[PDB]
Design a protein around this ligand. Structure first.
Ligand SMILES: *Cc1c(COP(=O)(O)O)cnc(C)c1O
Ligand SMILES: *Cc1c(COP(=O)(O)O)cnc(C)c1O
Lengths: 318, 312
């Protein structure tokens, strides 16, 4: 009988889909397909690390539902993934965040029964991290996921994401194009596929306004999900063949085009990923080559984010 | 290579998941599992009919993306599904709705590039239907999908939803519990499975203040997605064994419990479905029986619509 024990067994195994209009309109020579991480149970790639970081820590005997309080600073999708996972497996979870985070995302975390603690909006993610550290020190048995440093983050991408790409393309994949958040996705795929296919190339994506992997300064940008303004510990920097930078407006416009010309409602990072993949596919040396690009999230979350953001902007003017 | 041509090929094939806390805490004797329609590409059961109603019409040679303007009087998940399908297959799509529609669902429809035609609030759904008819009659080749009347609606559920339930339970399924919106889901499942297993039982769900299938009067309610205030043409009332009515607050509460106790963020109609399933599963005669419950949508959409009306 095909009945899952709980929702955490339903993450990953996401499909590939070809693009029928955008690459053609852009005169692409390479072949672009999208991996739909938006089709995870809670609609983002995170679901893979939300589940595995906890599974890994359980399997190692570090954590237990009856005793361990989970803690993590997070203003993005990892919080949602952890909240779902914790509710499914019976964990108490505390998430810390800046007050600036969308009300929609706060309601999402609370809906899953996560405990929220807000931190000053000016202190950014830095205040959230410091507060998260206190809470772990305050609670015996407590455990910090540390998504940017946790080895089980790239591990799950090695074990699942990479194998799905390898199998579904039957070894034909020539490129991965992936925006870097924690860097877990691109790293796991790079580690596995480069070891089987040395010709396989790895293309990282980051905001133009925060071009840190390219060697520039960190900065404010609007590509939610990528570009944390430092180089994450879990990122295998040695495996990256190229970084492409994408403006906020490019990322947004290609997101609009994915929705309207392909029927793929996606977050802004999907638009960033595609933008970079388009440039890559236009290069003559890449004709006939198979480019896998990640859609990190379904776009409905981002849409309500933009809606609440617009409401707040109009009431804060003058 | 295992690569879909487009997103419409990624619809359905949704998983079953067991519940580990709610039925146990309610002293259930039957076994409850949820079918997660929230895992469709645009996060609702609708994706099946949005795609298939268009697909069926193409194979009948009635429509073509190059010439056909699609039209439907809908504000809800069907609109979203049709908009995704139209965008994926290259169709122009016009959706009509009263001007009293939630901006989140309007925003979603525009995100997919659907054309929206708003109708007066005073006219309700009837005004949207009438305007949709006028648009159709005005445009040569234009085609209305008519979700409540279209036979391809129950068809897709016969061909996919029912087969997935049958196969995934290896024929062991004893009950389907599903709220009725168009009634396509419950009808398609009933038709196929009752044919294969006469003992199999069909339990419909409707709102307490609109108990129309039970034989009552249409009224207002908060269970989004079900209870349209009439019996749809596509619903096969003859195949239903029992109707359970659920209140707004019961549906909402069980929705909350799905989120917090199972990690299954679901719409309010999932809460209503589960509520009915719990009562069913508490009956001694149903001990050990396998109850399949529809989760019609992922709950992010509904949570979002709630918050915007808390500002409106
Ligand atoms: C996590 C995430 C990324 C990047 O994924 P990593 O594995 O963390 O590099 C991109 N976009 C969105 C929306 C995300 O949630
Ligand atoms: C469609 C829908 C239902 C009922 O499905 P039908 O097949 O139309 O009966 C229930 N809830 C929600 C949220 C829906 O979108």
């Amino acid at each position: 009988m095909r009945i899952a024990h709980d929702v955490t067994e339903l993450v990953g195994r996401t499909p590939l889909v070809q693009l029928n209009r955008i690459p053609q309109a852009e005169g692409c020579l390479g072949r672009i397909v999208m991996k739909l991480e938006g089709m995870n149970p809670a609609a983002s790639v995170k679901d893979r690390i939300g589940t595995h970081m906890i599974n890994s820590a359980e399997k190692a005997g570090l954590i237990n539902p009856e005793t361990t309080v989970l803690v993590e600073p997070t203003s993005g999708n990892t919080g949602i993934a952890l909240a779902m996972t914790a509710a499914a497996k019976g964990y108490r979870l505390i998430l810390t965040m800046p007050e600036t985070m969308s009300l929609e995302r706060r309601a999402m975390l609370k809906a899953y029964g996560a405990t929220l603690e807000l931190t000053p909006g000016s202190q950014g993610m830095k205040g959230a991290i410091l507060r998260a550290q206190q809470i772990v020190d305050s609670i015996p048995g407590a455990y910090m996921l540390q998504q940017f440093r946790n080895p089980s983050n790239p591990e799950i991408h090695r074990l699942t994401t990479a194998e799905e790409i390898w199998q579904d393309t039957e070894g034909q994949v020539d490129f991965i194009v992936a925006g870097v958040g924690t860097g877990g996705t691109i790293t796991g795929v790079a580690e596995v596929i480069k070891s089987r296919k040395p010709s396989f190339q790895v293309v990282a994506v980051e905001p133009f306004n925060s071009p840190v992997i390219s060697g520039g300064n960190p900065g404010p940008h609007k590509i939610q999900g990528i570009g944390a303004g430092f180089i994450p510990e879990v990122l295998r920097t040695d495996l990256i063949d190229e970084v492409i930078t994408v403006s906020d407006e490019e990322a947004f416009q290609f997101g609009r085009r994915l929705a309207k010309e392909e029927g793929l409602l996606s977050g802004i990072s999907s638009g960033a990923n595609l933008c970079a993949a388009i440039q890559l596919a236009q290069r003559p040396e890449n004709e006939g080559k198979l480019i896998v690009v990640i859609q990190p999230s379904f776009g409905e979350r981002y849409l309500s984010t933009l809606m609440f953001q617009n409401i707040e902007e109009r009431e804060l003017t003058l």
